């Protein structure tokens, strides 16, 4: 009953430090076909590989941007996929070292018996898939369960499959090498409060860190990708640094110190307010023995997407909207970002 | 939080007491292919479709044999089979009031860090895959959990794994119209006594109905197929009496008489062994609120098989040999076996 | 890792199926001094040691009462009392093959952070309590939970907190030698209908027996105390039949058949309510692998204790309606009660 | 489902801060009578309540030895027992800024059908009690749960009737006023070797710490005593550091930060080696969000006993090797102690 020992421990340990590296986070390019299918009705641009393959060419090959990255997070089709010139994304990553990431969860299900809420699907051959994902090249990986915050939610079915399905996935992860993200997204909607949310995702993570040590999970090979502590889409904002306060707290009373890094997801937040709020964490006096950095995808790309439109043109004035979107929230990670 | 109330909920609970009505059991029929491969490959039969749908239409065509049998277990290629002669086998068995059954797991995995402990594949995708197989005639399901006896073993974490495994199955059978049939098997390897299993089969089970109460499973249309409780693979055997009144205990401590019929598996049992077994528990004098049958595999079929020798000339002495399986299991349910 | 294997484990086999012999239950008159005098200040009856040890002798020597009980379950103080005349109320009930039990709880203290929820103490110092209770001839316990129905209660820590202390005091008792009654009460407070109670009931009674698994208690030594499965207090009542239908549907899904017999709860029900309850229940259609009598406390006495006022010259007729109370409840335990 | 949001919130912060405070830790005089008859037996004193008055104001009243010191824990005598000039004890330390601490278990009792496991009495009437340590001036409690190393021990049993029994105890004492220590002592009886006490001990904290967040305790306003990572009494001992390295390991994996300070127990550890492993670990790189401090017995006072042998004469020289004893450990707090 001693945690993960395998071959794989030291390797698992080094590459999860490194997603902690100060100043650097995570770009999250694993969009679905169906979400990208959105985000390019934005821009009014029609769904095709090739204009998905140009975007991720786009943004991974911005002058500099991958000086403030440590790691990305693939969809199954990126991961093999090339530049223009033939050079395969991975090496692109490998050479300026940064850890390629893939998603390997399947979405969600409806639990039979509650009011809307989600376990999540995926484990099934979830080792084969991994090791073949090690192969070709990724180091972590990325498994997304969703709760709701209701009259009775999250239930207590809810927490237990959401989290004994993470420590689950997290252990077959590290036996085939993959540093896992556990993500317990906590939906923003409803008219709570900041304090409700507060309580749920401090009981949430709780049920989260205790199912991992069940399962034998070795700590200092994980992260964690959780929402922030904010009220919810019907109640009234409250001032970043409040959100700052109870997001830290909620995490020094939940979180054990071995994992060494929060990546934090923006949920539906502006551009700004997610790199506002990540700035007064890390500006927060207080106990914060892991490195809160960011996971964004949406809170990273949007105003790239605008101004590019799906253009050849518009490359060069996309591409250095991205690089200081990445110098914005890279200084966000240091406490240095002033708006 | 109530039970299953939804549309399945009157069939499930008829179909589910007619699996018990008196004198009649289960035929497992239900090997894979790679399973039924070295079944063939002992009576030097080729593996073929042909081979595999011949010693089906040769089991479930038996003049009489349907009398015995409320249900048939099959695996998917079997469910959509027919008879040389075109007919479903389907349609053989809803002639003759018998319910087709239909195996829904993908077989075991190790638990990482337990000491070659296994949990059961098979919920992704489950209640889609269960719609189709009721939509083809299918009214139960089997899915097989497997449990070991060991210095330390079964552990805490593998039979809530196992558990929770079968009662996030139990549900999402019920609401596609499956009665589900719940099996923790354990296995009697090693040199424990018969006392070491009966702990080990009281705890299991009461792990597995507060799964199932948890999961908001309707108890009325359910069924279970435990282990008999008996001593170790490496131990001296007892008389059947004992094997009977152990395993009537272990049951009466644990199963709800909501649920209306067990159907024992038999293991590595002789043919004989499982029915002088299941005839002791019949005869035994005690509280029996429930339906004590079969549901055998290897226990019914191992000399038909040996019988026939995938010949076409072996076919009528091969049925003979399978009828008198069925009639003597059927007289077991009802304490009139006499050897 | 085995279930209670010990010295008293046939003692305890044959007096928990004792209890369920058809035709009896169970008498419980386990007021506390608190208790008892508020229904004495009910009948005008000052409530010294002498009246509570008058209302008792009533009880217990009533001709023929005993006749219809199987156990009666005792106060600490009346444990260790005697008749007018000096016999042990105890040796009165050895002589009528009644079994004495005992109240072993020290009532309820609220659950810091919830909403008005309750645990039950009583853990310290219980094995000693038991082992001495036993040497003076008790031969069951009890012990009761409480629960409400709310918004969000029970909630996840209540209903852990009351099994798992349930479990570890049946336990306790079994290693004294005494029968555990498991009580875990659903109180009926709230506007809920039946679908509700049936619900948090069937979930409430399968944490108690999965704990009592956990702490490898010896179900046939066991007995359940359970309440009946009923709307709310501020809800329309239902016919009769349909309580009887639910509560034993709640018990066909969660109660093991090892466990010999339910002793029905009453709670605020009237003494007549009870008795209805009680035979439509064994009128049922079904499987009932477990004898349904009662243990009821309000539910046999409301009537003698105003009949009797304190006197000393109404006994006779007070002695009558209890044997009355009795007489009927015991019919109903065989599906016989025929009204009036 | 908030955590403890009481009037003693800000109070129960404070001191279980000021328990940390850099340089001091707790001084542990709450024998019982039976257990200092053990003491005295040994150096032949009777075991009067004089002589037990007289060894506590020996210690209390040690020239100079409450600057190594933030907490004393006292048995219930002791609370209200008074210097022979007739100054209360809770007034001395209250006047060296030292917080008076009360022991609130009732000891251990065997658990039905275990081997020798123990729970730990005391919940009953616990919250009246705290109330009236409060109003005669203790301000935090001490509460002894004991788990032992064998074939099949800790038991699943075992470690939620101890967890939750904490927990419980926890919860209560802040409602009212003291700041609880949550001790699970793994007691090093036995053969086993270091990694399976790092395996129990990471398992149990695991567990404690869940059950804390179950009952809504207040984390920032309790602390720890755990035992140290070690070698079973029975085999062979390893090196000072390596006890360190295990030891921060165990509580970086479990320990969420909030809590301000862990206040380690010395087993049987002779009065060096605890003071040479609690150097050890401060001197440790690593991420240690929390004060690693003592809460000693028999390790800061074993040697004071033997000197003072009960005599008014030897007062001044037992007072010396008392004072000794709380430097050390004072500086090994600091990674400044050097033999």
Same mark, same amino acid.
């Given at each position: 009953?001693?945690?993960?020992?395998?071959?794989?421990?030291?390797?698992?340990?080094?590459?999860?430090?490194?997603?902690?590296?100060?100043?650097?986070?995570?770009?999250?390019?694993?969009?679905?076909?169906?979400?990208?299918?959105?985000?390019?009705?934005?821009?009014?641009?029609?769904?095709?590989?090739?204009?998905?393959?140009?975007?991720?060419?786009?943004?991974?090959?911005?002058?500099?941007?991958?000086?403030?990255?440590?790691?990305?997070?693939?969809?199954?089709?990126?991961?093999?996929?090339?530049?223009?010139?033939?050079?395969?994304?991975?090496?692109?990553?490998?050479?300026?070292?940064?850890?390629?990431?893939?998603?390997?969860?399947?979405?969600?299900?409806?639990?039979?018996?509650?009011?809307?809420?989600?376990?999540?699907?995926?484990?099934?051959?979830?080792?084969?898939?991994?090791?073949?994902?090690?192969?070709?090249?990724?180091?972590?990986?990325?498994?997304?369960?969703?709760?709701?915050?209701?009259?009775?939610?999250?239930?207590?079915?809810?927490?237990?499959?959401?989290?004994?399905?993470?420590?689950?996935?997290?252990?077959?992860?590290?036996?085939?090498?993959?540093?896992?993200?556990?993500?317990?997204?906590?939906?923003?909607?409803?008219?709570?409060?900041?304090?409700?949310? @507060?309580?749920? /995702?401090? $009981?949430? %993570?709780?049920?989260?860190?205790?199912?991992?040590?069940?399962?034998? =999970?070795? +700590?200092? &090979?994980?992260?964690?990708?959780?929402?922030?502590?904010?009220?919810?889409?019907?109640?009234?904002?409250?001032?970043?640094?409040?959100? @700052?306060?109870? /997001?830290? $707290?909620? %995490?020094?009373?939940?979180?054990?110190?071995?994992?060494?890094?929060? =990546?934090? +997801?923006? &949920?539906?937040?502006?551009?700004?307010?997610?790199?506002?709020?990540?700035?007064?964490?890390?500006?927060?006096?207080?106990?914060?023995?892991?490195?809160? /950095?960011?996971?964004?995808?949406?809170?990273?790309?949007?105003?790239?997407?605008?101004?590019?439109?799906?253009?050849?043109?518009?490359?060069?004035?996309?591409?250095?909207?991205?690089?200081?979107?990445?110098?914005?929230?890279?200084?966000?990670?240091?406490?240095?970002?002033?708006?």
């Amino acid at each position: 009953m001693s945690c993960y020992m395998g071959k794989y421990a030291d390797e698992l340990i080094a590459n999860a430090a490194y997603i902690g590296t100060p100043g650097k986070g995570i770009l999250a390019a694993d969009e679905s076909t169906g979400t990208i299918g959105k985000r390019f009705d934005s821009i009014k641009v029609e769904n095709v590989e090739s204009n998905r393959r140009a975007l991720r060419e786009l943004l991974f090959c911005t002058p500099g941007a991958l000086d403030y990255l440590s790691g990305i997070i693939l969809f199954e089709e990126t991961l093999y996929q090339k530049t223009a010139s033939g050079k395969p994304f991975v090496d692109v990553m490998k050479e300026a070292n940064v850890l390629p990431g893939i998603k390997v969860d399947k979405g969600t299900v409806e639990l039979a018996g509650t009011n809307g809420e989600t376990t999540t699907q995926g484990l099934d051959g979830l080792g084969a898939r991994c090791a073949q994902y090690y192969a070709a090249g990724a180091r972590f990986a990325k498994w997304r369960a969703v709760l709701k915050i209701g009259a009775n939610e999250p239930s207590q079915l809810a927490i237990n499959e959401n989290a004994n399905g993470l420590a689950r996935y997290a252990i077959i992860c590290q036996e085939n090498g993959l540093v896992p993200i556990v993500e317990p997204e906590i939906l923003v909607d409803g008219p709570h409060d900041i304090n409700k949310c @507060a309580d749920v /995702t401090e $009981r949430v %993570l709780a049920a989260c860190y205790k199912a991992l040590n069940d399962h034998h =999970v070795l +700590l200092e &090979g994980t992260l964690l990708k959780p929402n922030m502590v904010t009220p919810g889409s019907d109640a009234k904002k409250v001032a970043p640094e409040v959100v @700052a306060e109870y /997001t830290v $707290r909620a %995490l020094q009373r939940t979180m054990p110190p071995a994992v060494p890094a929060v =990546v934090f +997801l923006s &949920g539906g937040q502006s551009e700004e307010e997610a790199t506002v709020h990540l700035n007064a964490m890390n500006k927060l006096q207080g106990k914060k023995p892991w490195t809160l /950095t960011f996971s964004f995808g949406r809170a990273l790309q949007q105003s790239t997407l605008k101004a590019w439109a799906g253009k050849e043109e518009n490359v060069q004035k996309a591409q250095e909207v991205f690089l200081i979107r990445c110098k914005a929230n890279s200084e966000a990670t240091l406490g240095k970002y002033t708006g």
